[PDB]
UniProtKB/Swiss-Prot annotation:
<feature type="domain" description="Bromo">
    <location>
        <begin position="2"/>
        <end position="106"/>
    </location>
</feature>
<comment type="function">
    <text>Scaffold subunit of various histone acetyltransferase (HAT) complexes, such as the MOZ/MORF and HBO1 complexes, which have a histone H3 acetyltransferase activity. Plays a key role in HBO1 complex by directing KAT7/HBO1 specificity towards histone H3 'Lys-14' acetylation (H3K14ac). Some HAT complexes preferentially mediate histone H3 'Lys-23' (H3K23ac) acetylation. Positively regulates the transcription of RUNX1 and RUNX2.</text>
</comment>
<comment type="subunit">
    <text>Component of some HBO1 complex composed of KAT7/HBO1, MEAF6, ING5, and BRPF1. Component of the MOZ/MORF complex composed at least of ING5, KAT6A, KAT6B, MEAF6 and one of BRPF1, BRD1/BRPF2 and BRPF3. Interacts (via PHD-type zinc finger domains) with unmethylated histone H3 at 'Lys-4' (H3K4me0). Interacts with trimethylated 'Lys-36' of histone H3 (H3K36me3). Interacts with ING5; interaction directs BRPF1 to H4K4me3-enriched chromatin at the 5' of active genes. Interacts with KAT7.</text>
</comment>
<protein>
    <recommendedName>
        <fullName>Peregrin</fullName>
    </recommendedName>
</protein>
């Protein structure tokens, strides 16, 4: 029970804060299938921050869970695909940790709406 425009402004700010935590920009764009040919073998729904931005602007995120679930896919896909001893796996752990605090604060703000 809130107005659409302030909520989308909040999601835009939140997405920018999450992208800031991905300092290597390894999640900024879809995983390039041309360089990872086996990626889709067990990754059923790829996700990335650019796709999240397009979903946001297409009005596909109307509650915080819609938005947070796609963020969680970025993390979980990366933990699934990559071995634990890789920078990519550890980057997803770091993003989960640093991004979780960003998400908790942003969800508090949405609940004031
Ligand atoms: O090759 C990649 C490039 C950027 C991100 C990736 C996330 N998981 C597996 C592979 C990736």
């Amino acid at each position: 029970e809130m107005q659409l425009t302030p909520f989308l402004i909040l999601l835009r700010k939140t997405l920018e804060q999450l992208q800031e935590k991905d300092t290597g920009n390894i999640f900024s764009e879809p995983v390039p299938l041309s360089e990872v040919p086996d990626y889709l073998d067990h990754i059923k729904k790829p996700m990335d921050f650019f796709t999240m931005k397009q979903n946001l602007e297409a009005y596909r995120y109307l509650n915080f869970d819609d938005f947070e679930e796609d963020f969680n896919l970025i993390v979980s896909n990366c933990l699934k695909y990559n071995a634990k001893d890789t920078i990519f796996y550890r980057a997803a752990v770091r993003l989960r940790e640093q991004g979780g605090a960003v998400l908790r604060q942003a969800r508090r703000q949405a609940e004031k709406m």
